[PDB]
Structures are given as C-alpha cells and as structure tokens.
Amino acid sequence: HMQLVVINGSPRKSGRTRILATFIEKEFNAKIIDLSEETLPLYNGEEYQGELEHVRALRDTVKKADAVILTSPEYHSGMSGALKNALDFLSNEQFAHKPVGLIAVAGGGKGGINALTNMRTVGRGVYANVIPKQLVLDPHCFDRENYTLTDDSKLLVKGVIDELKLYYKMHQY
Amino acid sequence: MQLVVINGSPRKSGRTRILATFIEKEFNAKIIDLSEETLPLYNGEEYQGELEHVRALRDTVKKADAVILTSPEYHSGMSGALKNALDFLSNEQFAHKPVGLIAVAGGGKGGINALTNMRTVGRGVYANVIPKQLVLDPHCFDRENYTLTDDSKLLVKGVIDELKLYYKMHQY
Numbered sequence: 360h361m362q363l364v365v366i367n368g369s370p371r372k373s374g375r376t377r378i379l380a381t382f383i384e385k386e387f388n389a390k391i392i393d394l395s396e397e398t399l400p401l402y403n404g405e406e407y408q409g410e411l412e413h414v415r416a417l418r419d420t421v422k423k424a425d426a427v428i429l430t431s432p433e434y435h436s437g438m439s440g441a442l443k444n445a446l447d448f449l450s451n452e453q454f455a456h457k458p459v460g461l462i463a464v465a466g467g468g469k470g471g472i473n474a475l476t477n478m479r480t481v482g483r484g485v486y487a488n489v490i491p492k493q494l495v496l497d498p499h500c501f502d503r504e505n506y507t508l509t510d511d512s513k514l515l516v517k518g519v520i521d522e523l524k525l526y527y528k529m530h531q532y
Numbered sequence: 533m534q535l536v537v538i539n540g541s542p543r544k545s546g547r548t549r550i551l552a553t554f555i556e557k558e559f560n561a562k563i564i565d566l567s568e569e570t571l572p573l574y575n576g577e578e579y580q581g582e583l584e585h586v587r588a589l590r591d592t593v594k595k596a597d598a599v600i601l602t603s604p605e606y607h608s609g610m611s612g613a614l615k616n617a618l619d620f621l622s623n624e625q626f627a628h629k630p631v632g633l634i635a636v637a638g639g640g641k642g643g644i645n646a647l648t649n650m651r652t653v654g655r656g657v658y659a660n661v662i663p664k665q666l667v668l669d670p671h672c673f674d675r676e677n678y679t680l681t682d683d684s685k686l687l688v689k690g691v692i693d694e695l696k697l698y699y700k701m702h703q704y
C-alpha cells in the first residue's frame with residue numbers, strides 16, 4: 360500500500376550504499392533514485408533545468424511517494440554532495456509532512472551520526488516528518504563479494520521500514 | 533598570507549557570488565567560483581583526479597594559508613555544489629588550516645544550519661574552523677549595484693581579520 364521511494368545517496372558505482380539502496384528496492388518493492396547513474400546534473404537554479412527529463416522525474420517520483428528512505432554515505436562528516444545536490448532540486452512541495460527514514464553508511468568507528476544529523480536538519484528544512492528511528496551501517500554490515508547485506512543488517516533495515524510504515528499509516532489516518 | 537575564497541552558490545546570478553567576488557577583490561584572495569560549473573559531480577573514480585579543474589581545486593586549497601568557505605543556505609545546509617567540491621578534498625589540503633565560514637541566507641533565522649553543516653564538515657577534514665562566523669541576509673547586499681553594503685563589508689573584514697590572526701598563530 361505504502362508507495363516507498365529510496366534514494367541512493369552515494370555517487371560511487373562500486374560503493375556500499377548502492378547495495379543497501381538496491382536491497383530496499385528489491386525487498387520492499389521501492390522505486391530507486393540511483394545517484395550513481397549521474398543522470399541528474401549539478402543544480403544551478405536556472406529555469407531550463409526544470410524541463411530536463413531526469414529533474415522532472417526526480418520531482419514527480421518524490422512528490423508521489425507516500426514515504427522516502429534517504430540513504431547516504433558519510434563523506435567528511437556530512438551527507439554526500441551528490442545527495443545534497445539532488446535535494447537542492449526538491450522542496451517542501453515534494454516533502455511537506457512526508458514520513459522520511461534516514462540510513463547512513465559509514466567507514467566504521469563512530470562514523471555516520473554527522474551524516475544522519477545533516478540529513479535530519481535538511482529533512483526538517485524541506486518540512487519532511489523525519490521519523491525517530493535511524494540507522495548507520497558500517498562495512499561489516501555488507502558482503503561486498505556477494506553484493507548483499509548481512510542477515511543482521513537486513514533485519515535492522517526492515518526495522519526502519521516497519522517504523523516508516525507506522526508513520527505512513529498515521530499520516531493516512 | 534595566501535587567502536582562498538570558495539563561492540559555494542552554483543547560481544550565476546546569486547547573492548553569494550557578490551560576497552565571494554568582494555573578498556577576491558578587497559582581500560587579494562584567489563576565488564574558486566562554483567557558479568562556473570567546471571568541477572563535475574564527484575564519483576570517486578580515478579580519472580577525475582586527472583581533470584585540470586580537480587587538480588587546480590586540490591592544489592589551490594592545499595597551497596592556501598587560509599580559506600573562507602562561503603555558501604548559501606539551501607534547505608538548512610550548505611549548497612550541494614559546495615559539498616560536492618569538498619568531497620574532492622580531504623585532510624591532505626585542510627589539516628590545521630584556518631577556515632572562516634560565511635553563510636548567505638534568505639532572511640529571518642536562516643544561515644545557522646548552513647554554518648553548523650560547514651563547521652561539522654570542516655572539522656571532518658581537520659581544518660581549524662575559527663570561532664568568528666557570519667550570516668549575510670538579503671538586506672546586506674545592494675544587488676542592483678552588485679555590491680555589499682558598507683556595514684556588510686565591515687562584518688566581512690572582521691572575519692578576515694580573525695582569520696589573519698589564526699594564520700599568524702599557525703605560522704608557529
């Protein structure tokens with residue numbers, strides 16, 4: 360019932376975040392926005408960008424979503440430049456009161472919380488309802504050799520989606 | 533005292549460019565003007581490190597004695613254009629470098645979220661982000677004459693003056 364969109368915030372074609380975003384796509388029947396495809400240009404605020412097929416598709420896909428998972432790697436203690444660039448095309452027109460769940464992909468140690476805070480702050484900036492439950496996945500959460508999440512990491516991801524579904528239900532109610 | 537200023541707005545007609553070009557001219561700073569769109573989207577691939585503009589970005593920031601980061605506040609964060617540019621950089625160019633933050637906002641309480649994002653990312657590349665920071669709102673610009681107001685020029689000088697003191701301290 361919930362029309363879920365997942366944004367892959369990593370621009371790296373061979374990166375870890377893409378494993379997570381494609382897991383959500385396949386396992387939860389989510390529409391992926393895969394920033395590793397580089398079909399969205401740098402935002403420059405010019406009118407012609409609003410006519411580009413991929414800018415219109417980004418805006419339409421996020422507006423129509425019942426809920427969004429924003430995934431990002433932590434790059435230098437923030438979300439990716441790629442993800443922020445995509446969000447610069449969007450606004451409260453597509454996000455107002457939309458349930459949003461955040462998942463960051465980190466390099467281990469204490470990485471990921473700075474990206475999650477950046478994402479929560481920007482999320483509130485477009486007036487999304489960023490849910491309480493959030494998640495950081497470290498490299499041990501990934502089997503890169505088989506392009507998958509570990510069983511434990513699939514369960515942690517499901518926990519975010521389950522809460523996001525409860526927030527979707529409340530927004531419908 | 534080799535100063536670099538990054539214009540974080542990608543908008544050719546934007547306000548932040550007035551501030552960044554003010555600093556370039558008044559304080560003899562080298563500008564990195566992201567409205568030129570000569571830097572592509574970061575993708576981590578090896579070939580990007582051979583691009584002239586990526587090499588220029590890295591060399592310009594590495595050799596700077598001090599850096600002003602300017603950004604507009606876009607959705608309560610620094611611009612995607614500025615964050616994209618920083619994703620090319622690292623502690624290799626920033627470690628212990630004095631860095632001053634100036635955000636350009638739309639009025640009201642805008643600009644602090646951008647400053648916070650820039651300070652957190654700046655520490656993440658191990659810069660010494662100085663205490664003094666600034667937000668300029670639309671009234672700080674005379675856009676018709678492509679200039680800052682005299683009051684705004686004094687505020688910008690205050691940031692530069694503190695950055696020069698931190699530069700001198702780092703010369704230890």
Ligand SMILES: Cc1cc2nc3c(=O)[nH]c(=O)nc-3n(C[C@H](O)[C@H](O)[C@H](O)COP(=O)(O)O)c2cc1C
Pocket residue numbers: 369370371373374375376377432433434435436437464465466467469470471576619620656
């Ligand atoms: C430009 C860049 C900066 C990074 N900075 C951080 C960091 O601040 N915190 C962190 O936990 N990992 C950092 N990493 C490592 C990522 O967490 C790691 O690459 C992870 O797999 C997610 O990125 P990916 O989806 O592109 O693979 C950084 C990696 C890159 C490419």
Ligand SMILES: Cc1cc2nc3c(=O)[nH]c(=O)nc-3n(C[C@H](O)[C@H](O)[C@H](O)COP(=O)(O)O)c2cc1C
Pocket residue numbers: 404447448484541542543545546547548549604605606607608609636637638639641642643
């Ligand atoms: C995509 C976008 C989002 C913006 N979000 C914010 C915001 O969160 N806070 C704010 O103070 N102003 C916001 N503004 C207004 C900017 O502060 C204003 O455009 C200002 O002139 C700086 O941007 P510029 O240098 O591109 O002109 C936003 C503008 C754009 C284009």
